[PDB]
Design a protein around this ligand. Structure first.
Ligand SMILES: Cn1cc(C(=O)NCC2(N)CCCCC2)ccc1=O
Length: 116
């Protein structure tokens, strides 16, 4: 509360660590469905069904331009990528399984990097 300061973690490396994690995602073999925005004019249903689209390139732009206030908002956009993928794709489709694989891949790096 007012004048009662909770000790806080050192966040000074967060930008560079989130960037490294995103680089790992971008280079993963199963990243291809998520590297660019879904083409809203060529993919039936996407625009109406998926209320907040997100992809790695948009995340990279937001990270490179100071649009994430904290690491929690960065992980929200990452998780949004895979939530959208689950909403729109069958678990066993190529894109659907890629999303599941990428989510697991992300969450381990997140715990390994920040749950010190
Ligand atoms: C996350 N996601 C992606 C698509 C999609 O179209 N991805 C790219 C592709 N169509 C065009 C360039 C490479 C070949 C495949 C559809 C539904 C979805 O949920």
């Amino acid at each position: 509360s007012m004048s009662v300061k909770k000790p806080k973690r050192d966040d000074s490396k967060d930008l560079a660590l989130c960037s490294m994690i995103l680089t790992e995602m971008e280079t993963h073999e199963d990243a291809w469905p998520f590297l660019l925005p879904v083409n809203l004019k060529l993919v039936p249903g996407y625009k109406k069904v998926i209320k907040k689209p997100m992809d790695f390139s948009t995340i990279r732009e937001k990270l490179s331009s100071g649009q994430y206030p904290n690491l929690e908002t960065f992980a929200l956009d990452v998780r949004l990528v895979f939530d959208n993928c689950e909403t729109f794709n069958e678990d066993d489709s190529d894109i659907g399984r890629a999303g599941h694989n990428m989510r697991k891949y992300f969450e381990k790096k997140w715990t390994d990097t920040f749950k010190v």
